[PDB]
Symmetry: C2
Subunit: 353 residues, 2 copies
């Protein structure tokens, strides 16, 4: 295989290549070798491929028509490492997911349903489902509009994304330790998985305010060591095995809001300070805000009602999460805004094997 | 039918050209008005945006470049080639300089698009470089009449091997300046140290690295942090701009500052190039032609090859670049490679 049809899209704040599953090799070794060559990996500059020399622009979506009930398309996310000959499918990316809906409609995997088309997506990495609402004026996708997200210039068509079946998707339960709060290394934390395994703790409990600049936190070795020691100590409690070399759980340091939101966060993913917050991590953090007695509930401003908009402040702005909660208190769905844009469509080429 | 009514588009081939990357267009496929063309190309790349997240640029000037190619009507020329730099974090598209790396993709692009017919197993493509008025001849491997990008050729800064693209340069004397020696005399002296103002494809100031207080072997960070050195050579550049017929070069990127030193790794010359303020990782393709041509001040340190076809290996930080000169300088040939990465249609949000 020396080529494959491919669409290059921006999905959220990430970028990568979108493939039909039938257009990629069935053998995972042959597939990974093809995608590495497509990106130009391994190479810190990715000069001989389509990767942008950054993990956020070295990503792949594998999309196929789904035989699952109620699901339109299956979606496999793959991170193509920039400077290593490694392609991984552990954990799912909620930004590349934003392009899956429009891509499936454009490719004919899902018929457009009027001027606005809802696409039910099965996320194969963690077995959860997202429903993306795509603008399809006159029966064809558009990527233009008045919606904006932090980290992307200008405005685009909105892609509301509703997540369900998120609780314990990676850890097997919403609270894998069975506790709303666990004391780890002398500090109270919440171990929670509502779409993305997270450790939620007060920024003040680890010696910062939680409003520091991303670059200042990224260079705070003492803080990173304290957080990492906690992350290693809860890997088994969260049913994640040995998390030494894993990118999970994400470390979420929370603080009361300062820009009008519900809560403020600084996220380490697990080592680098995030410029915003992960889309699935936002669902976990927002859900943690609703658990009484937890560090997030202590600092969050939670509105009343069955439908709560939880604006999560992060270094470059805020990401709002709409939580639908039953009369008992359980989060039945979470909806967040993303956008996408088809950038180039055609065929990617690699040198033959 | 079933197209985005709020976007525009054009056919485009994304290629690696040498150590650069960008989009290759047919001239007829872009808007004819400069302003409309520039807005389109900025949107193609996702500029302005330091991350270029909403476009095809790679958040680096070297991966935010454009080639505009068309069938030429100049005598002896196959295609005309306009190089355009799409700025990453500014709403700027410029044609002021000539990239000899994006040039490597032009030949194969022209053949794949049918601008030039394949003449057997190797195809010679005469390329008029409209930015500077120079002519380059690229020899493209076309086995069975089809362009190939696979082969045993290697260049520093690119992993693996690819099909060789030998690129011979003609009409390089005074590409940006009046003639080969813009000042009029060969070895002039500015601020006390002897230099050589020479333009044989890229306007340069050639001078001995010892005459400026360094050895010529330091690393990129150690030279770019050297405020003493950069200030000394910048004052040399700011005092030769009008003398090299370049106007006021305070805001320009030309001429390139070339600090020469004897070779260490077995090459011909070691050079440190400031382009004009950043320490160049390797060396510019056209800059290497000007430096190889400079070899009395450059002859101080040069182990010049012997025969009539000299392979001058110019040692730069990340390795070496070899410039074949035939002798009076007859031709200047350098090795490049290219690869077609993606082919299809690029899309932009409509301007309004
Ligand atoms: Ca329109
Ligand atoms: Ca249009
Ligand atoms: Cl498929
Ligand atoms: Cl990486
Ligand atoms: Cl995500
Ligand atoms: Cl910040
Ligand atoms: Cl990390
Ligand atoms: Cl044309
Ligand atoms: Cl730039
Ligand atoms: Cl060049
Ligand atoms: Cl510079
Ligand atoms: Na279409």
């Amino acid at each position: 295989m020396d080529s494959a049809p491919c669409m290059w899209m921006r999905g959220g704040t990430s970028k990568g290549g979108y493939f039909l599953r039938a257009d990629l090799p069935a053998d995972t070794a042959a597939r990974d070798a093809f995608l590495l060559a497509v990106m130009g990996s391994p190479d810190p500059r990715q000069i001989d491929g389509m990767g942008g020399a950054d993990p956020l622009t070295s990503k792949v979506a594998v999309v196929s028509k789904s035989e699952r009930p109620g699901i339109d398309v299956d979606y496999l996310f793959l991170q193509v490492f920039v400077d290593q000959a490694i392609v991984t499918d552990a954990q799912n990316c909620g930004n590349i997911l934003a392009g899956v809906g429009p891509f499936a409609i454009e490719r004919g995997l899902v018929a457009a349903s009027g001027d606005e088309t809802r696409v039910a997506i099965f996320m194969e990495n963690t077995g959860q489902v997202a429903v993306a609402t795509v603008r399809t004026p006159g029966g064809s996708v558009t990527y233009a509009g008045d919606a904006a997200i932090d980290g992307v210039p200008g405005t685009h068509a909105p892609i509301p994304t509703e997540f369900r079946d998120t609780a314990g998707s990676s850890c097997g339960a919403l609270l894998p330790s069975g506790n709303a709060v666990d004391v780890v290394n002398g500090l109270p934390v919440t171990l929670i998985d509502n779409g993305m395994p997270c450790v939620v703790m007060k920024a003040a409990d680890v010696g910062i305010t939680g409003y520091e600049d991303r670059d200042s936190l990224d260079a705070n070795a003492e803080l990173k060591a304290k957080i990492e020691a906690i992350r290693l100590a809860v890997g088994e409690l969260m049913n994640l095995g040995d998390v030494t070399e894993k990118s999970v759980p994400k470390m979420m340091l929370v603080a009361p809001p300062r820009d009008g939101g519900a809560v403020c966060v600084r996220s380490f993913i697990p080592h680098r300070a995030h410029a915003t917050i992960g889309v699935l991590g936002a669902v976990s953090v927002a859900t943690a805000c609703l658990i009484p007695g937890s560090p997030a509930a202590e600092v969050a401003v939670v509105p009343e009602g069955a439908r709560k908009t939880l604006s999560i402040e992060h270094p470059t702005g805020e990401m709002s999460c709409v939580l639908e909660v039953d009369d008992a208190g359980n989060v039945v769905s979470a909806a967040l805004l993303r956008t996408a844009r088809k950038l180039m469509d055609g065929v990617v080429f690699v040198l033959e094997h």
